[PDB]
């Protein structure tokens, strides 16, 4: 009877840090998948199953819209088979991903004079994430042999670090809102 509400996740006022990424489910609607592809307001619009056109020529069991902010330079890691700090410890697409990644520069909203420190990424983790895993732990990370006994200090690091989004940042270091669409019948073209 009505549109899938992509205005809820795309034009949302606040976005989530990558370590604690948000995920919306999308059911029982129809989604015009070419008012996103023909927008032109998106720096990035890659898909990994089949085409943004034949996608709205199909129905699916359910659709996922994951959202988060990262550095523009890290968007190359939101893709199957990548590595790096974001794909390993924060948000991991599976090797067989069928969906679309969308990204736009957000330097007007998410950057601040003096640095915007509310966006965080996970810097320290002993081992890689599984695909579509969310880790929101803040347990002190033990980098040496001695246990930390719950005290931040040497070899005893808080695992989350801040992107200090300042406006004067070079564009590869500016904030990028990202949305990932997953496809696995409730919504169609």
């Amino acid at each position: 009877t009505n549109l899938c509400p992509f205005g809820e996740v795309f034009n949302a006022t606040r976005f989530a840090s990558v370590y604690a990424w948000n995920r919306k489910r999308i059911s029982n609607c129809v989604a015009d998948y070419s008012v996103l592809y023909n927008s032109a307001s998106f720096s990035t619009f890659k898909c990994y199953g089949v085409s943004p056109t034949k996608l709205n020529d199909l129905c699916f069991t359910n659709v996922y819209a994951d959202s988060f902010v990262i550095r523009g330079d890290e968007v190359r890691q939101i893709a199957p088979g990548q590595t790096g700090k974001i794909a390993d410890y924060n948000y991991k697409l599976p090797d067989d991903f069928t969906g679309c990644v969308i990204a736009w520069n957000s330097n007007n909203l998410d950057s601040k004079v003096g640095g915007n420190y509310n966006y965080l990424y996970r810097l320290f983790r002993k081992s890689n994430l599984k695909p579509f895993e969310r880790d929101i732990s803040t347990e002190i990370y033990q980098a040496g042999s001695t246990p930390c006994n719950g005290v931040e200090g040497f070899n005893c690091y808080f695992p989350l670090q801040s992107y200090g989004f300042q406006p004067t940042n070079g564009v590869g270091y500016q904030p990028y809102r990202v949305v990932v669409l997953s496809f696995e019948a409730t919504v169609c073209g």
Epitope: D73, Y89, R125, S127, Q142, G144, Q161, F165, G170
Partner: antibody, heavy 117, light 107 residues
Framework: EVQLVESGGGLIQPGGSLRLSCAAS????????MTWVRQAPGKGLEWVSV???????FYADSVKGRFTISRDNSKNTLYLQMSSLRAEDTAVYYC???????????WGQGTTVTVSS | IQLTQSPSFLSASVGDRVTITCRAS??????LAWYQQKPGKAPNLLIY???TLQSGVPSRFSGSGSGTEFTLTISSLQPEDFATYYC?????????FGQGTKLEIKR
Amino acid sequence: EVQLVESGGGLIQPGGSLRLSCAASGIIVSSNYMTWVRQAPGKGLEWVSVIYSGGSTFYADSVKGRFTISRDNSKNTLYLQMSSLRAEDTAVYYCARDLGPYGMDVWGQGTTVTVSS
Amino acid sequence: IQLTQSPSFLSASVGDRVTITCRASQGISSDLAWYQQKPGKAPNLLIYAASTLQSGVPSRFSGSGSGTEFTLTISSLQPEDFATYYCQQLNSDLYTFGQGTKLEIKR
């Protein structure tokens, strides 16, 4: 207490191969970003290689396809496998623990690789 | 990103205030470190996050800066402070350093 102790450098014929060790104590090598950095005679500091705690590995373009970084957790040691050596690989090589926003805080004393006939 | 230090060589007497700068080409917020390298030795961290003193380093070293202009100050030079000093971009997937500034003690 906390130290990186390297070894393995010396004279090596061009196109040949050589492996450097970096024994750590206090620091657990498998739980850190470990890098290799090198300094050519009279020049600046050039990053070579990094290995993430979770496994991933990255290399500078000048080194891709000839160097391999790895570690033995049972001996808490970092390795740099260097193959197919060139004359611009002559340098002092340093291992160093990288901490992101805090910098590289712990360095080995360095080992000297001299590629010559 | 490319990091440029100035001067490249510099000379000052025991007791002078000394200031080195690092220009970044694109704008790196506070992601900058400073290292000292004595001849024959490995680099020691002095400053991380543009202005934070690393544990153990004497208090006559200090950093200020943000964006593209970073400054390293030695408020009262010591004879042992001749070295080469390097800046470094932090959170850089190339681990970029500056060319180095050689500091000599005037006497």
